[PDB]
Design a protein around this ligand. Structure first.
Ligand SMILES: CCCCNC(=O)[C@H](C)CC(O)[C@@H](N)C[C@H](C)COC(=O)c1cn(Cc2ccccc2)c2ccccc12
Length: 333
């Protein structure tokens, strides 16, 4: 059909990128992460007991103030890699930058403080495929596409390096003010998942890893690059990084020395120098700069998989293509 719209997103410290949807008539503004790993939409419920302190610190959806809410009620539990939330389903109209769509979503009734006491976004909007939607709630993008409004059945991510605009999603296309050189499309390995095949991680000069072909979720709703705790440990052993429990660290003076590491995603040799993966908070002899790669064991479901999160999407503009079932990366301007 023809139209494109775009969601500007705010960037919080290169670790949280969230935009804004409005649910209801009148609209109730919510901050959300637009994440390609999940496929359901949820937001905190006014009904959340505020004995969950993530609920007494976030926007809550009040359906009694919405004229257009159509009550449904089926329980829902989203078990994400990092934490879980449960609640029930509701339906109201959600507005995703310009396009308005009736949508089934979750009003979360239970929301752990860890980690959601530290999340600057209030909800999640999944850009995944229906194969992952808990409870087969038709996901907002298959809904927008039914409007017939978009030019192209695609969406693209720009995640800025921060301090200017924080990032941008374009629904319906991709915006060449933000990428240079031209695209490199890798096809999806099955439909249902923004998943692709990866065959080789190389620390410095020589393939230490995934030499026999691994997978990679390309995950916009993840701050880091991650591999399973084995693949990560040998990468980290090699770099010389230590574990301060949730992350690996390095003595900051070494940071600007750490080898370029490269991802050989189907076709090309996508490659991050040590600016790209190290948070250079300083350049001291001793103090510790965290690295932007985490171990994360994504569960059997999809797989154990490497998740290419926001450390990678900020170096290469990601176009997610549903019409031809493939992902394409090209360089960020
Ligand atoms: C549809 C459910 C079944 C699939 N579930 C999964 O396991 C997938 C892999 C989960 C997945 O996308 C995760 N990678 C992210 C998760 C949805 C997003 O929620 C999060 O836990 C968070 C994600 N962030 C950081 C973040 C925020 C915005 C953009 C990038 C990264 C948080 C910060 C503080 C607190 C919680 C989170």
């Amino acid at each position: 059909g023809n139209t494109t719209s775009s969601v500007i997103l705010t960037n919080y410290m290169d670790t949280q990128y969230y935009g804004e949807i409005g649910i209801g008539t009148p609209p109730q503004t919510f901050k959300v992460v637009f994440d390609t790993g999940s496929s359901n939409v949820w937001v905190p419920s006014s009904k959340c007991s505020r004995l969950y302190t993530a609920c007494v610190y976030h926007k809550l959806f009040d359906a009694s103030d919405s004229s257009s809410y159509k009550h449904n009620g089926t329980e829902l539990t989203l078990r994400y890699s990092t934490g879980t939330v449960s609640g029930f389903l509701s339906q109201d109209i959600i507005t995703v930058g310009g396009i308005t769509v009736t949508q089934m979503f979750g009003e979360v009734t239970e929301m752990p403080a860890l980690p959601f006491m530290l999340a600057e976004f209030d909800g999640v909007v999944g850009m995944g495929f229906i194969e992952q939607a808990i409870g087969r709630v038709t996901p907002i993008f298959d809904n927008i596409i039914s409007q017939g409004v978009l030019k192209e059945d695609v969406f693209s991510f720009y995640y800025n390096r921060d301090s200017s605009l924080g990032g941008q999603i374009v629904l319906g296309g991709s915006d060449p003010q933000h990428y240079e050189g031209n695209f490199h499309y890798i096809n999806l390995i099955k439909t249902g998942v923004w998943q692709i095949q990866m065959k080789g991680v190389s620390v410095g000069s020589s393939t230490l890893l995934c030499e026999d072909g691994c997978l990679a979720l390309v995950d916009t709703g993840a701050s880091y690059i991650s591999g399973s705790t084995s693949s990560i440990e040998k990468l980290m052993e090699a770099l010389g990084a230590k574990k301060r429990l949730f992350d690996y660290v390095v003595k900051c003076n070494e940071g600007p020395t750490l080898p370029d590491i490269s991802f050989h995603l189907g076709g090309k040799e996508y490659t991050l120098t040590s600016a790209d993966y190290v948070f250079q908070e300083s350049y001291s002899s001793k103090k510790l700069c965290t690295l932007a790669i985490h171990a994360m064991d994504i569960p059997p479901p999809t797989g154990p998989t490497w998740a290419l999160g926001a450390t990678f999407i900020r170096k290469f503009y990601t176009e997610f293509d549903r019409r031809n079932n493939r992902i394409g990366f090209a360089l960020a301007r």
